[model samples]
Target: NKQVAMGRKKFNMDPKKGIQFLIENDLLKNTCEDIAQFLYKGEGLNKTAIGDYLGERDEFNIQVLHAFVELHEFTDLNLVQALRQFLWSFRLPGEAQKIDRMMEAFAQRYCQCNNGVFQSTDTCYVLSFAIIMLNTSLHNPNVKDKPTVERFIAMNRGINDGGDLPEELLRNLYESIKNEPFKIPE
Candidate 1:
């Protein structure tokens, strides 16, 4: 297809400008023809209406990402930073019985696997554990909504806007998710 020849070489790079500027400048626009064809089951959408549906879908996806960001407690990085630290403690070391202890516990608790190992391929298990952690951290009996993904996303957008989730909250959440059965969906 000679797709390789479509590439270009750059020269005389400007140190003052960010590489993102160049990347954005070279990004191509799509007409959504491929998506329309697939959506219409290979027949494709009418040319007149394609733009409207495509715009709506794109907007929906953006909202989902925004919601995901909120649910995961990803603010200016207090809770997320702490969670990263907690997860990183499981890294392999030269010597230690507890080298991957936390990860082993996660697998045992969420995946129902007592193998004492975390597999890269078992991402669904990881995602389940993450959701459990997020929901537990944000849990409140006062709130009426069930802790579904969509509800959590909606709620956390307004709830956790600050740095530093309380230590008590973290402790309680850790205990709760650890005890509760994870009904993680695929």
Candidate 2:
């Protein structure tokens, strides 16, 4: 079984062809189910045929392709950071397919302004705005103090202000929780 797993049958993967094959064979018609299958089963009979399931030149497929490419070469920090350009394109673990639908809805409804144009990206436009706001707020030196971060986390924990704590504070808190539990300071 190990030898078979190491053979050409398991080794071959073509991103463009994979995307095209997905569409051509109706594999893309049920992306949510298919992704769930891959997540839970480890491998399915159709899993080996991923290249055939994906189709070429599709934006959705391209996102998955870029993610796979980055995963393949994660040792290169520069390349990994560069991959952030495709962050909106790539989907997360549980919401991969659902996010696609959500993005489409967001793009159609709010992407257009008085100029009657929408950004070409199909994802993360609102998230980008949120990040920009968070960054501006964190720029004040006072925000870096311990009391502020703790207060922000505590206040936001109970109220659903669209989202929770900002990424800047979350990152610091997460590291503190993981690396220095005693020093977390509530």
Candidate 3:
């Protein structure tokens, strides 16, 4: 009962952190146990594992923010690459119109703050989109592996040592599309 309530709150309040917890502890495998239920079924029992997962996830989020800031310094936006390695498959072609509206709306409302990163409120959609992308890329033969997106989402992950910021993700995406690098996964 209590676990379920916590899971409900976690899902309702912030699923990004919830999913992060699920990944870190490998609690997704457990059915309704302490961490498992809190993770998979949202049966939160208030275990220490949940706390640890959240902490780790937060750290990962910070790392991503830093990376974005650094990337922007080079006057490059790798959103598509971020999308590819992290967010491509999750993009909704059917919902593209909706996403466009939302992105524009968010930019107008939040970008005014000049925070560089998209609005914090955007994290929800961002995480969901990332998950969707991972699922899609893995299933499609033409979609090359871009697990780096997931790695970026994880707090402990970092850019490859001495990685260049000039590698525009959008450009790579354009190239990929031109080359037909992505095929629908069978």
Candidate 4:
């Protein structure tokens, strides 16, 4: 599976995708149903535990995803907090696909602000902002063609709303997509 680190943040745990209105999408409910049932059946969690910790009904409940920390993935801290002792056993489970769609919606609406004049309907706005920054930084000649590390950091700060995004992931994200022109999601 492809991995995109949240950088210092524990992936899906911290900065939870907090979809309070997820009931609007029954597809996600079914997905949650399978996993929740697996925990009770396919995995080892008992029905009582499911009900207590997750509000997961024996079958599938409307609140399936809601009771699970607002759809947030708890950490290794969660498991250790469970066991009476620690032998380094831990678990990390997450789903960014829904988050991916959320981001897609965010980017779509963001691009719509300019009627797609400043960005593409087909891509995330973070990347769109990056591409725009690159365009300006590279071609303007008013400044250096490529950004210095400090300059790049500032660029990221602006893109991420003062976030100190990790360099490797940030650079990797930019470099990986830098060469490819934006395309239609279609």
Query: After superposing candidate 3, which stretches have Cα over 4 Å from the reference?
Result: 1-79, 85-93, 102-173, 180-186
Model 3 C-alpha lDDT versus the unseen true structure: 0.36
What is the TM-score of each predicted model, taking all chains together?
A: 0.19, 0.24, 0.23, 0.26
Best-matching candidate per TM-score:
4
lDDT string, candidate 2, 98-137, tens digits = 4344334333333332112222333224332333234435
- Per-candidate Cα lDDT values, in order, are 0.32, 0.35, 0.36, 0.35
Question: Which 10-residue window of candidate 2 scores lowest in summed lDDT?
Answer: 177-186
Specify the poorest-scoring 10-residue window by lDDT in model 3.
156-165
Clashes of each: 0, 12, 17, 0
Question: lDDT per residue, candidate 3, 53-103, as tens digits?
Answer: 322324443333223222222123333333333222122223464444433
TM-score of 2: 0.24
RMSD in order of candidates: 19.5, 14.2, 15.1, 17.4
> Which portions of model 4 miss their true places by more than 4 Å?
1-127, 135-144, 148-150, 158-162, 183-186
lDDT tens readout by residue for model 1, 1-186: 122112111101221121123234553222233222222231212222221222233454223222322222222332223244333322222223322332333333332322222233144234334544464454545645445544333433322333332445445444544455333211
Residue 134 lDDT in candidate 2: 44
* lDDT score at residue 132, model 4, on the 0-100 scale: 43
- Cα-based RMSD of candidate 3: 15.1
